[PDB]
């Protein structure tokens, strides 16, 4: 599962992933609650799902 | 189109709707971006859609 960042978001906890508009997020593990875990080149972490769009195929 | 509040939200703007868990939001009109316009009581305003569940 991959996704691309639609809105910027700054981590607020050491377990969160700071994402920026455009980046592709990989190794994405879903889960209800509004937060997903995945990696963007650098770090891995929990990022807010409503700020990114899931890629197809 | 109605929904029920899942998380609490304190409207941080004159045009925002303050919502509380359990409340029924109605006359909701959607719009991309993370904010919906709906109504509770006699109050209407904008609130984050991921903060409520749309009733089936």
């Amino acid at each position: 599962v991959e996704a691309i960042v639609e809105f910027d978001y700054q981590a607020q906890h050491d377990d969160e992933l700071t994402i920026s508009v455009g980046e592709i997020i990989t190794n994405i593990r879903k889960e209800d609650g509004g937060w997903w875990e995945g990696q963007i080149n650098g770090r891995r972490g929990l990022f807010p799902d409503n700020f990114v769009r899931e890629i197809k195929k | 189109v109605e929904a029920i509040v899942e998380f609490d939200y304190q409207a941080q703007h004159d045009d925002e709707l303050t919502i509380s868990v359990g409340e029924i939001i109605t006359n909701i009109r959607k719009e991309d971006g993370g904010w919906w316009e709906g109504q509770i009581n006699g109050r209407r305003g904008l609130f984050p859609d991921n903060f409520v569940r749309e009733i089936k």
């Binding site: 809105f7 807010p48 409503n50 700020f51 | 939200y9 991309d32 993370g34 904010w35 991921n50």
Partner: peptide, 11 residues
């Protein structure tokens, strides 16, 4: 131009 979206609370 919608305002910035809000993340769902960490619960």
């Amino acid at each position: 131009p919608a305002r910035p979206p809000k993340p769902r609370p960490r619960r």
